[PDB]
Amino acid sequence: RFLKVKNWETDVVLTDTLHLKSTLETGCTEHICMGSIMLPTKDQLFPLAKEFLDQYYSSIKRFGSKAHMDRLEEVNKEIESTSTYQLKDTELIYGAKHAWRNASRCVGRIQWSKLQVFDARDCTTAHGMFNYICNHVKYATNKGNLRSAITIFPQRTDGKHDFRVWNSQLIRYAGYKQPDGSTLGDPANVQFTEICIQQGWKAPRGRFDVLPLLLQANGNDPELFQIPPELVLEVPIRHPKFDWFKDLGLKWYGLPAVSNMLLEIGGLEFSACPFSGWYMGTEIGVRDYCDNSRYNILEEVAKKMDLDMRKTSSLWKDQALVEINIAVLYSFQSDKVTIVDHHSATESFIKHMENEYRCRGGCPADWVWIVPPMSGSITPVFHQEMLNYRLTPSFEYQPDPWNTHVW
Amino acid sequence: RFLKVKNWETDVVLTDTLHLKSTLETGCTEHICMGSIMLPVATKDQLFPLAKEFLDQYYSSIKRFGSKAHMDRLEEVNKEIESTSTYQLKDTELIYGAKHAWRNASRCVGRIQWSKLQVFDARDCTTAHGMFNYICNHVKYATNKGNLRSAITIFPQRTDGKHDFRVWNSQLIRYAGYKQPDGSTLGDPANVQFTEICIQQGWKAPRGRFDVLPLLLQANGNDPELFQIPPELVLEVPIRHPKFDWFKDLGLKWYGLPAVSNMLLEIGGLEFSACPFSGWYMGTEIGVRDYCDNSRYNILEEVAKKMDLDMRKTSSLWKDQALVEINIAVLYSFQSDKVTIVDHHSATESFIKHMENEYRCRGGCPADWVWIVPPMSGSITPVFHQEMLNYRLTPSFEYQPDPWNTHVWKG
Ligand code: HEM
Ligand code: HEM
Ligand SMILES: Cc1cc(N)nc(C[C@@H]2CNC[C@H]2OCCNCCc2cccc(F)c2)c1
Ligand SMILES: Cc1cc(N)nc(C[C@@H]2CNC[C@H]2OCCNCCc2cccc(F)c2)c1
Ligand SMILES: C[C@H](O)[C@H](O)[C@H]1CNc2nc(N)[nH]c(=O)c2N1
Ligand SMILES: C[C@H](O)[C@H](O)[C@H]1CNc2nc(N)[nH]c(=O)c2N1
Ligand SMILES: [Zn+2]
In A129-169, where do the E strands start and end? 149-152, 164-165
Instruction: Identify whether B280 is a catalytic site residue.
Output: yes
Nearest CA to ligand 1 atom 17: A106
3-state secondary structure of B187: strand
Does the beta carbon of A34 lie inside 6 Å of ligand 5? no
Q: Quick one: which of B126, B55, B34 has its CA closest to B394?
A: B55
| Active-site residue identified among B225, B280, B292, B325 | B280
Distance of CA A392 to the CA centre of its chain: 16
Determine the Cα–Cα distance for residues A361 and A365; give it in Å rounded to an integer. Answer: 13
Determine the Cα–Cα distance for residues A379 and B96; give it in Å rounded to an integer. Answer: 40
Determine the Cα–Cα distance for residues B373 and B134; give it in Å rounded to an integer. Answer: 34
Which of B99, B167, B285 maximizes ligand 4 atoms within 8 Å of its Cβ, making it the mutation to test the pocket?
B285
Instruction: Identify whether A28 is a catalytic site residue.
Output: no
Q: Quick one: which of B256, B337, B341 has its CA closest to A312?
A: B341
For β-strands A262-265 and A394-396, DSSP reports them as: antiparallel
CB neighbours (10 Å) of residue B24? 13
Does the beta carbon of A369 lie inside 6 Å of ligand 5? yes
Contact B369, B29 (CB under 8 A): no
CB neighbours (10 Å) of residue B16? 23
Residues across chain A: 407
Burial class (CB in 10 A: 0-12, 13-18, 19+), B124: exposed
Determine the Cα–Cα distance for residues A204 and A210; give it in Å rounded to an integer. Answer: 10
User: For residue B289, which atom of ligand 4 is closest to its CA?
Assistant: 15
Partners of A388 on chain B (C-beta within 8 Å) are 32-33, 35-36
Bond prior to B276 in cis (omega within 30° of 0): no
Phi and psi at A374, nearest 5°, equal: -135, 155
Contact B324, B376 (CB under 8 A): yes
How many CA within 13 A on the CB side of residue A395? 21
- Contact state of B380 with A9 under an 8 Å Cβ cutoff: no
Determine the Cα–Cα distance for residues B273 and B156; give it in Å rounded to an integer. Answer: 8
- Is B359 known as a binding-site position? no
Q: Quick one: which of A284, A188, A186 has its CA closest to A234?
A: A284
Determine the Cα–Cα distance for residues B168 and B172; give it in Å rounded to an integer. Answer: 9
Q: Which DSSP state fits B286?
A: I
Spatial neighbors of B324 by CB under 8 A, at least 6 apart, are A315, A318, A319, A322, B376
Distance of CA A21 to the CA centre of its chain: 24
3-state secondary structure of B233: helix
3-state secondary structure of B237: strand
Does the beta carbon of A8 lie inside 6 Å of ligand 6? yes
Dihedral, CA of residue A63, residue A68, residue A69 and residue A74, to nearest 10: -160
Computed from CA positions of residues A226, A272, A121, A89, in that sequence, does the dihedral angle turn out positive or negative?
negative
Computed from CA positions of residues A362, A364, A368, A369, in that sequence, does the dihedral angle turn out positive or negative?
negative
Spatial neighbors of B71 by CB under 8 A, at least 6 apart, are none
| Active-site residue identified among A71, A106, A166, A316 | A106
Distance of CA B198 to the CA centre of its chain: 22
Nearest to B8 among A8, A38, A343 (CB): A38
- Contact state of B32 with A388 under an 8 Å Cβ cutoff: yes
Phi and psi at A340, nearest 5°, equal: -125, 140
Computed from CA positions of residues A152, A154, A158, A163, in that sequence, does the dihedral angle turn out positive or negative?
negative
Which chain A residue lies closest to B294 (C-alpha atoms)? A9
User: What separation in angstroms does the CA of A130 have from each of A28, A149, A165, A225, A227?
Assistant: 40, 16, 10, 7, 8
Distance of CA B237 to the CA centre of its chain: 21
Phi and psi at A265, nearest 5°, equal: -125, 130
For β-strands A149-152 and A116-119, DSSP reports them as: parallel
Partners of B13 on chain A (C-beta within 8 Å) are none
Determine the Cα–Cα distance for residues B215 and A131; give it in Å rounded to an integer. Answer: 73
Residues with CB under 6 Å of ligand 2 are B 102, 105, 107-110, 113, 117, 150, 152, 263, 277, 279-280, 282, 285, 342, 347, 371, 397
Bond prior to B49 in cis (omega within 30° of 0): no
Determine the Cα–Cα distance for residues B385 and B378; give it in Å rounded to an integer. Answer: 9
| Active-site residue identified among A123, A278, A316, A356 | A278
Residue type, B279: G
Contact B60, B73 (CB under 8 A): no
Please give the span between the terminal C-alpha atoms of chain A, in angstroms, as a whole number. Answer: 50
CB neighbours (10 Å) of residue A147? 16
How much distance in Å is there from the Cα of A360 to the middle of ligand 7? 22
Spatial neighbors of B62 by CB under 8 A, at least 6 apart, are none
For β-strands A13-16 and A262-265, DSSP reports them as: unpaired
Q: Best mutation site among A315, A331, A350, A382 for testing chain B: the one with the most B CBs within 10 Å?
A: A315
User: What separation in angstroms does the CA of B279 have from each of B104, B177, B231, B282?
Assistant: 16, 24, 19, 10
Partners of A344 on chain B (C-beta within 8 Å) are 314-315
Determine the Cα–Cα distance for residues B411 and B409; give it in Å rounded to an integer. Answer: 6
Contact B399, B107 (CB under 8 A): no
Please give, rounded to a whole number of angstroms, the shortest distance from the CA of A163 to a CA of chain B: 28
Burial class (CB in 10 A: 0-12, 13-18, 19+), B35: buried
Contact A195, A215 (CB under 8 A): no
Q: Strands of B166-167's sheet, edge to edge?
A: B166-167, B215-218, B225-227
Domains observed in chain B? 16-123+150-160+264-278+348-372 (3.90.340.10), 124-149+164-235+399-403 (3.90.440.10), 236-258+281-346 (3.90.1230.10)
CB neighbours (10 Å) of residue A53? 18
Q: How does B372-383 read in b/e, with b if 16+ C-beta sit within 10 Å?
A: bbbbbbbbbbbb
CB neighbours (10 Å) of residue A325? 26
Please give the span between the terminal C-alpha atoms of chain B, in angstroms, as a whole number. Answer: 56
Q: Which residues sit directly before a break in chain B (C to N > 2.5 Å)?
A: 40
Instruction: Identify whether A109 is a catalytic site residue.
Output: yes
User: What separation in angstroms does the CA of A164 have from each of A148, A159, A169?
Assistant: 20, 11, 12
Instruction: Identify whether B111 is a catalytic site residue.
Output: yes
Longest dimension (CA), chain B: 74
Determine the Cα–Cα distance for residues B357 and B253; give it in Å rounded to an integer. Answer: 37
Resolution (angstroms) stands at: 2.3
Longest dimension (CA), chain A: 74
Q: Which DSSP state fits A284?
A: I
Q: Quick one: which of A387, A311, A375 has its CA closest to A14?
A: A387
Partners of A36 on chain B (C-beta within 8 Å) are 35, 369-370, 386-390
Dihedral, CA of residue A30, residue A32, residue A38 and residue A44, to nearest 10: -40
User: What separation in angstroms does the CA of B86 have from each of A134, A190, B18, B245?
Assistant: 74, 63, 29, 59
Dihedral, CA of residue B320, residue B321, residue B327 and residue B329, to nearest 10: -160
Partners of A370 on chain B (C-beta within 8 Å) are none
- Is B384 known as a binding-site position? yes
Nearest CA to ligand 4 atom 22: B38
Strand partners, A32: A29
Does the beta carbon of B169 lie inside 6 Å of ligand 4? no
- Contact state of A34 with B33 under an 8 Å Cβ cutoff: yes
Determine the Cα–Cα distance for residues B348 and A42; give it in Å rounded to an integer. Answer: 51
Determine the Cα–Cα distance for residues A205 and A202; give it in Å rounded to an integer. Answer: 9
- Contact state of A34 with B389 under an 8 Å Cβ cutoff: yes
Nearest to B30 among A28, A291, A366 (CB): A28
Contact A190, A201 (CB under 8 A): no
Q: Which DSSP state fits A228?
A: P
How much distance in Å is there from the Cα of A3 to the middle of ligand 5? 25
Spatial neighbors of A338 by CB under 8 A, at least 6 apart, are A144, A145, A146, A254, A278, A279, A332
Q: Quick one: which of B192, B175, B189, B328 has its CA closest to B254?
A: B175
Strand partners, A149: A116, A276
